[PDB]
Design an enzyme around this catalytic site. Sequence first.
Site, short mmCIF file in Angstrom:
data_model
loop_
_atom_site.label_atom_id
_atom_site.label_comp_id
_atom_site.label_asym_id
_atom_site.label_seq_id
_atom_site.Cartn_x
_atom_site.Cartn_y
_atom_site.Cartn_z
N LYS B 208 0.53 -1.08 0.01
CA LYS B 208 -0.02 -0.43 0.15
C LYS B 208 0.74 0.85 0.61
O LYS B 208 1.25 1.83 -0.84
CB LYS B 208 -1.35 -0.24 1.30
CG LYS B 208 -1.71 0.80 1.48
CD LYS B 208 -2.53 1.33 1.99
CE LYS B 208 -3.99 2.09 2.01
NZ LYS B 208 -4.08 3.83 0.96
N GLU B 214 11.39 -4.70 2.99
CA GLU B 214 11.43 -5.93 2.67
C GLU B 214 11.05 -5.92 0.98
O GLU B 214 11.66 -6.17 0.11
CB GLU B 214 10.60 -7.49 3.06
CG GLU B 214 11.05 -7.43 4.67
CD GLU B 214 10.03 -6.37 5.00
OE1 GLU B 214 9.60 -5.78 5.11
OE2 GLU B 214 11.08 -7.04 6.22
N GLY B 269 -4.31 -5.80 5.91
CA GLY B 269 -3.51 -6.83 4.87
C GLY B 269 -3.69 -8.17 5.32
O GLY B 269 -4.26 -8.67 4.22
N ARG B 270 -4.11 -8.68 6.43
CA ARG B 270 -4.70 -10.14 6.64
C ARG B 270 -6.07 -10.19 6.10
O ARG B 270 -6.78 -11.36 6.26
CB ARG B 270 -4.01 -10.30 8.12
CG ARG B 270 -4.95 -9.79 9.21
CD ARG B 270 -4.34 -10.02 10.55
NE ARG B 270 -4.70 -9.08 11.23
CZ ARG B 270 -4.71 -8.32 12.31
NH1 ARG B 270 -3.46 -7.63 11.13
NH2 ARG B 270 -5.58 -7.10 13.04
N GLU B 355 -2.30 -12.34 13.87
CA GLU B 355 -1.78 -10.99 14.44
C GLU B 355 -3.37 -10.10 14.64
O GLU B 355 -2.90 -8.94 14.88
CB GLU B 355 -1.32 -10.78 12.79
CG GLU B 355 -1.09 -9.30 12.95
CD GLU B 355 -0.34 -8.97 11.96
OE1 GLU B 355 -1.03 -8.54 10.72
OE2 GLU B 355 1.28 -8.74 11.61
N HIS B 386 1.89 -38.67 9.83
CA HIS B 386 2.98 -38.80 10.43
C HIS B 386 3.91 -38.10 10.69
O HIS B 386 5.17 -38.23 10.78
CB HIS B 386 3.92 -40.04 9.45
CG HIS B 386 2.13 -40.52 8.40
ND1 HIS B 386 2.18 -42.02 8.57
CD2 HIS B 386 1.38 -40.01 6.97
CE1 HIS B 386 0.92 -42.63 7.87
NE2 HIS B 386 0.60 -41.09 7.24
N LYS B 514 9.90 -4.16 13.88
CA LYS B 514 11.25 -2.47 13.00
C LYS B 514 11.41 -1.70 13.48
O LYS B 514 13.02 -1.13 12.59
CB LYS B 514 9.61 -2.06 12.07
CG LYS B 514 10.01 -1.58 10.74
CD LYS B 514 8.77 -1.83 10.11
CE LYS B 514 9.17 -1.05 8.57
NZ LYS B 514 7.03 -0.49 8.28
#
Lengths: 545, 549
Positions: B208, B214, B269-270, B355, B386, B514
């Site tokens: 945004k 990153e 975001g999520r 979050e 397993h 951050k």
Amino acid sequence: MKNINPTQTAAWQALQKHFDEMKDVTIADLFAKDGDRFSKFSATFDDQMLVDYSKNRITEETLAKLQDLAKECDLAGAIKSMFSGEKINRTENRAVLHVALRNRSNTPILVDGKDVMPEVNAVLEKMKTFSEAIISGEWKGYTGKAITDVVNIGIGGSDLGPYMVTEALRPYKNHLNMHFVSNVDGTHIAEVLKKVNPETTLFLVASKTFTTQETMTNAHSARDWFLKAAGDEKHVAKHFTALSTNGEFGIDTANMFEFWDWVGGRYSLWSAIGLSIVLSIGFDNFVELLSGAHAMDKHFSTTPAEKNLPVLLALIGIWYNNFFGAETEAILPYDQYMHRFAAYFQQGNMESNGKYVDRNGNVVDYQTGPIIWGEPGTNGQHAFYQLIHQGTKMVPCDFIAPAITHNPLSDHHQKLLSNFFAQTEALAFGKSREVVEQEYRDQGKDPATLDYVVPFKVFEGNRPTNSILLREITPFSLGALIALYEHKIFTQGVILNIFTFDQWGVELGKQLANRILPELKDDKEISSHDSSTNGLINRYKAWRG
Amino acid sequence: MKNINPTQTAAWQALQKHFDEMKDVTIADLFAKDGDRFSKFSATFDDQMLVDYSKNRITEETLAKLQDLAKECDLAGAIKSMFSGEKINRTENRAVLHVALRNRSNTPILVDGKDVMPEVNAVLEKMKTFSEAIISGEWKGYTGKAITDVVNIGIGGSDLGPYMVTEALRPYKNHLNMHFVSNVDGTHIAEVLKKVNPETTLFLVASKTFTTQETMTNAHSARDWFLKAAGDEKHVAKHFTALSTNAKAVGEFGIDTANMFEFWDWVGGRYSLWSAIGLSIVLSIGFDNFVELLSGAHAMDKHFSTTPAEKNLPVLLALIGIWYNNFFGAETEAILPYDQYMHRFAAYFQQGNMESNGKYVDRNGNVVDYQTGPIIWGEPGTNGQHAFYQLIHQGTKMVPCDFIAPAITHNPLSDHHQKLLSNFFAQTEALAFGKSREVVEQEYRDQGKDPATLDYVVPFKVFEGNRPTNSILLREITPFSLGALIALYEHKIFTQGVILNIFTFDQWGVELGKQLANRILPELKDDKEISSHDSSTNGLINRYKAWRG
């Protein structure tokens, strides 16, 4: 070996009273008191792996009392019992000898009066010479072409390690394209079959037992697919090998790479099961992987407990697992290649120590193994760290990172590492309301008008971590890193008085699924189960396709 | 909306006392006392998604009391507030309207007196047009070739959704090869760039602000590799688009701001895959299918907003989860889809859930003294079975699991599906009911063996069961069914948020990491020994300088 209930000892009682004195002590305080705290709570393995456990809620005294507990439970004897071939897997009556698999020094290790090393070393030599034939292009498919694709077919112990390690060590790979098929869900093999050519694909059917329903269902589907093109079953022998023990399946005896009962599935990547690793990165690097575990095996079996890394991490794990009562441990490698490392250890750890009946056959009333999870940084970091910083569950984390990347670009790595260092610093020390308020003042704002936001920006901190810095992820260092946890897992199992190497807990679901499968093969209403199982099975029949 | 402290309600207290009477009751007895239990503790959404919550440590009474709690907390008003555009995200003063993103009915939803639907629909129409030009081969790269590869570059909410969903819906994909980059670790972008051709590859920079470190580090490494082939920034516009609202930064990157697909601050975001951020989903499976994804979420939205609480699936799951989170004190929930394509489903909800509700200050600004969000984890069946099921069956931590499976597979292959499903059925059966010592001893006797001689093993084969699960059976995993499934959990998470008196839609817990990494980065550049932090941060930083080359 000794089977001591850790909770009934004097050392346990002492850890209990220490916990009461410690429970509100703060990591920021521990660092405030002792300026050289890092040097007192860290150590380096083989001049290449620094393990810093200083950001933990522990003092020299906590460690001493935890070492008192390890001694009370005769940890030293258990280690010697494992390394010497004693049959410590008592429920199955077996030795536990994944350490023999990587025994480069070739000291004899006896099982039933016989040295296992010659057979260990014969399978390895066989893997070397087979891999050369495949990689060099000397070994040809049924139409006379070199192999381009290798497809491993296995589940659990025959899948996670080989997948995890070939991913972790991609920088060391050759031209061969590797696929790992494990789910009985047909999409898994179907997605692979549609990318590979029958005349240039080598399948490895990996399975301790060679009876596993998933693996054999997948192997049979691959066989069928193969034969639809090759026509004749004499060709199967150019395209299928086995990693197990059982031959009418169609695999040349000579194509069978064996391992032994004293090799646990979840400790098996080191054996014949690691062939897909050998084919991917070559035999020398595989031997480097073995050598790294070996060096760590040496460290674990000969280092005094206070400087013994598998023990230290094990003991710190117990402090949180058993005294703080945290249920989970997060493993967070700052390394995209290692994106399957946490998943591997979900079996390594949880299948080993997820137990409730002690070595004396008595139900426990204290905690055993933790729940392992995590994703690599920085990915995990932007998913779920919110909760690790500001949730209501304490999650001990292991942050892992190499100083050197295999893919150096711009400033990517320094950015990656800066997060590695910053996140643990953040977790330990937090950020008070006064700092939050002062940041708002530095902007010319009156924090008294911001009560709607201010309290939510406070970080309590006091959240513990270990940090593991390696020079670089190499086959050797990775080998060492895996074994480090293998032996933490060992150490925790000895102390918690459980059986780390069996897995009877997988039986009931297989047996219950066995009863159910045939019931799916008719169009009849099922009612032999509880009303929920019946309900779901019948709705499935109504909706199926 | 109300901010009731749940622990101070009469309902909380009646639940506390009910738990003291329930804590040792077993699922076996619950099923033995009433043969109609399944039908009393399960419900189906849209004739296609059966949700069975009968293998839980609950009675009719437990559910009545949990419902009482939701009432005392004004769950109904809270739901009406979210859907109507009230600014319930109070720490950031924002609406919370992912429901608007997929509001196919187009009823107006007002924010600051303005209907958001027009802008929503305008971005969707623009995603449609763009996707058709890409998918059809009409849009050419710098050398006149159609696009073959799409690389998404984003982190967190800009990555987990798009990736999880394109994977889950691969049977609906077109010819485009999709790639997802998120890690700032250079490996991530590098492994993609070595497999794709600059002339036929389209990048989607999802961010945004268009300043995310990153993502922009990755985007810039891609631009660099691109120009090293193309030789001229004028071709950037043919190979990079932005999912963003920062037109200035986007244009400066070299992207035609005509290919800036935007979204709004009431899109978390999520919760963003339903927006512009889902462009890669549109590109992979087509706009038609993306609209089916949307419509499935909207049908669940209608279900959540209009169904009585007693049959409202997100509410029921949320309440049951609270029973284990707050009364049993279980720390975790496992999400276990028996579907290889959904292998990123659990990971997706580590963000969406953790979050969201991984929080410790209540809506009144007071620190909580009770449990909030659980820790989410899982792998698809049968793989996880397993790996870690040993601890779920025989450990000392209780792990409520949601097992999920479709009745139809998109890859029919002999008896693979029937085997897959037999595991899905059997595992919850095993976890609820277990296997007694008597049964274990009888099995040996029927071998003609004397179990008295088998002490070294018999005790270890006993399964005490009484481990709870939910089972979600769907007809089939479709864009629609998956849309509804994701939304089910989104609204479960909302409900828990409401009841637990926390803020589900912000994420202030990401900030400290951050700012500390920002301070540390410039210190990584020189060779100076570092002494600006605690002894451990210093020690690790310095070891790194010794070892980095």
